[model samples]
Target: VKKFPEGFLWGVATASYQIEGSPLADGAGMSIWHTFSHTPGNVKNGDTGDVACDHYNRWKEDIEIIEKLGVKAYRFSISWPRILPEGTGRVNQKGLDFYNRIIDTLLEKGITPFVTIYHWDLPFALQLKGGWANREIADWFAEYSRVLFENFGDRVKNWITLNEPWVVAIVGHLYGVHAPGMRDIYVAFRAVHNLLRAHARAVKVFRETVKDGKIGIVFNNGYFEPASEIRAVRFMHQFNNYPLFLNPIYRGDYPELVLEFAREYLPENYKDDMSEIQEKIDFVGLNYYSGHLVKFDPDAKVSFVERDLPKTAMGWEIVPEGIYWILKKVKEEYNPPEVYITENGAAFDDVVSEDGRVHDQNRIDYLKAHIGQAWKAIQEGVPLKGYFVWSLLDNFEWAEGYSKRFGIVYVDYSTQKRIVKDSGYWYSNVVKNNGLE
Candidate 1:
């Protein structure tokens, strides 16, 4: 048997905007996603998070499904606009009560709750005030973190400060592919600095206020290809992705290469704020899905090559070893005290059979291969303590919206019915056995 360490946390992860619908219910304010998705062209198929998985209304049922899956932890993000309707000064008790119920029930089932305070859902109101690009947003984020610690921190023993700040900066600000979209590299650079500043400020608040829990940030990254890949992949995979945030947190400044490339766009004397952006956190959460082959290009700096490898519905090449490679890379590079595979899974073109069940063998194969790599990473001395599959239910995927399904459980979008896929049962057994054979 390939065994995970004893007490290794096997869990599933979901984000608020992606899963929980009812964007403005119970005095909840609109989120950037609420605005972005409502915009006709922002998401594929013109789908919006207005209803999502209806998890806001079906959370109790979903929690029951989580219990049946046998996972010891459930990692989910809180919708910032839900708890604080206007993003500051006002508290939405009903919204707070909603999560309070979920947290309480998870504890009742003996499942640990891992809370992500910010998961790319800035309150739409904040976006009007410049959002992540505004330096003052750091203090605003810290204030919001304080609210979460004071309220949910007592029972939630693990917290994630932000989810993929790189995506927030690059995709949203630089490429204009996501919410509050803008295609300005200068603004993206400023957003990166402010994102790191927000993370540091939140960490400081978590330390002072949250008595029992540890806090960390989640970064979505994958290995770039060619066994001996060079400059292009290094710029795209290393300096341009998670390291944009990780470098500041772990090393107190940007990488030498990153500094050179982004110098013109960065805020004035950004290095002066490095100390404020450097804070010690308790763990690192890594989200790896897939990797692709890339090569250096003079004109574009990086160019992707079409790989002959198997691909997911999301067009990502299936490189199972990418998980193992990136895990060891993070461990050797920053050597954080601990790490968690916070989001790792795949999406496939799924269909319900005549028998009304989803036999998602592809998803099962994906999980098995990745988890095997995770086990191998542990064997080789990476301090990986947990693995949370990308999603529990097929919910709203950003940009792609409902077009992609990356869940162990299948959701009938029209009927709002949930069916546990074959992969879910397979994972349930993995949790039950504490490993796989």
Candidate 2:
């Protein structure tokens, strides 16, 4: 195994909605996710995160698990609804108090806290007022970020302004697969633009207010491969994935081909907001899971078609090489300041043995392959600084409910007990040694 630079971060990530239950506890306001998950047919099995992982109450034990795992850092999100119930105006002392305890505990355990301010849990108050589609959301997000910066900036040095805006915009708005589900491409595009604006606004606030800490935005990048040796296939591959998500944020403008193709679908004032969408970011958090096999679709109105690929238990394709391609592409195109693998891991149907150990060899192999790609990228000069597995424990898997498991530690939903899988042991050694072999 190649060695990573000294002080390289080894960590795991979890989001507020996916793991932290007690959605309305501590005087928190309702989030769109709380509503969506409760609606029948909106989520698989009608599962809601009302008590997912019970992290809100058991965060101290979770911190101990992180410390015992020997990781240098832990990446987690703060619920906006919890912090500022309405997403603006009066503060929620209980929400801030919960995070204060968590941060202090992590520091006491000698683990750095990489705090992400927003992770798709838009306060219900904000959504009711137009959510990400509203231009005013930029100011609301900036204000919410200010409150955190003022309170936690001294303790937390690394902060991510937003997580996977692509998912927030496309999956949540266009596909209706996530919270605040709305299936309108035009609205999705508008939401995407406004989200970038919100991120930039928050980042600008951080630079001006929390000058001591570092801030960045997390982007979920998926590598697209041409389905066949054909010109149309090649063009379709690039057109469908990159321009819609990657190009707009890094390059400032939607790809020329995208604008030309979806000329009629694009919202008004998109051209006017291009500059705000292009604001400089401090770092880029890359969340890579799989690659896409793309082919041209003539009969279908959409330009591309996804060719079948092997998938994980979560239905996401298993394509490790995509990590390398994504890192390389980001470096080559955006020349981003710094990069971290904020979320990368696979979900598998894990079974606990009679001895209480989870034999998750597939997850071990998945981590090894992806981390290997990350190491390869570092060797080739990708400025890759850290890698945080998707989750530390199995809690909730969003719309898929608790059915999918993507954690190094397995949680028996019935018992709420955490049993470290073999992968966790393997990862502990990787952290101790600072690399993979």
Candidate 3:
């Protein structure tokens, strides 16, 4: 492959609760993840972010790793509870200062600080008051966003309003698998409505607060191949994954295809807020990890067929070509002016060799194949702008905890030692070359 389009961006990403440790340190309030992870059985292996990567304390050294990687940007999230200890009123200057230093250092090193305002860590204090389920969260989120813009907008221009709201609403509420766990379908629907409202409010705040920056939401998207009806396949491909948010944000209403089934569950007069929920954003971010094979079944409505496709450590099927399919689909559908592969990488079993180095060739292959597909999409006019790997370091992997390794850079949790994996070195060369062979 030759070089990508001019000004193509490559970067690495990390979520606050997943990487930054000291969840309650420096006067930071507790996040739902803090409480959930601390609770017995909420996370695998009883792992917690209490000291995951120590990024809270070792960020300076971590930035040095990003600098070494030769990527143009470092995408990271700010801990909301760290900023507003109560999740609404009262500012934590110490928490703001921590990110201030990180942003300043990123600029000093010629790296753009692409910041995600919320990444699945709702302040536990807010959960006490009814987190995303409450319509009041829109205002709370807007207030928090105002704090961020007034503080970091000048230096850090690219902002992500929310990361994977589906994971927040569905997985966290409906499935009861993540923080603030609750298995209430009605609450999940309310959460879905409020989450979109929160995003629009944040974008509204960003518009008024940050004059020169761009703000967008990152959706966790996956591709699926149809084994049966095209209608069912299209519904699953678009509405099930992202149109629940994207259609509202970009098109000003929920996907019509899902309305009949979801209308009663959605908030009262949800359609009335379509105008307010639809806000113009500069870009859209798609975080794809795997693809699936789908079929329509009367009993189950829809089911995924088991396949012998190669899988990642997370049991996610590796289908690089799906990246191209999705990119093309997004262009054909919403046609956002700019799109970024904000998070795409695989988790694999990793071990350090006797030579004191870690080999993660599976990850290298995964990334390379995806990047190649990304290049094909761009060539075919998908308006793809940037690509950011899932993470820079192996840290807490949410419910899966430390069991899954997704970082190109390895971290020894015992002593907090950092070692760039072999794949990291390979990716560094690709970034330097602006293409892969």
* Candidate 2 per-residue lDDT over residues 235-320, each given as its tens digit: 44344443454566677677666676665666666777667666666778888887766556667233444457667897778888
lDDT of 2: 0.85
lDDT for model 1: 0.90
Please give, for residues 221-269, the per-residue lDDT of candidate 1 as tens digits. 8788754527677777666457777888888888767876888899878
TM-score of each: 0.98, 0.95, 0.98
**What is the C-alpha lDDT profile of model 3 across 1-437, one tens digit per residue?**
65788888899999998988999898999999999999998999999999999999999999999998898888999999999999999999999999999999999999988899999998999999999989999999999999999999999999999999988998999899998889998898899899989999999989898899998889888888887546667668655576878888878888876685577889778988889988898898999999888887788177889889999999999999988888998888889999999999989999999999998889999999999999999989999889999889998999999999899999998899999999899989999989898
The residue pairs in collision within model 3 are: none
For model 3, the stretches where C-alpha displacement exceeds 4 angstroms are: none
- Please tell me which predicted candidate would have the highest lDDT against the true structure: 3
Ranking by lDDT: 3, 1, 2
Worst 10 residues of 2 by lDDT: 234-243
Clashes of 3: 0
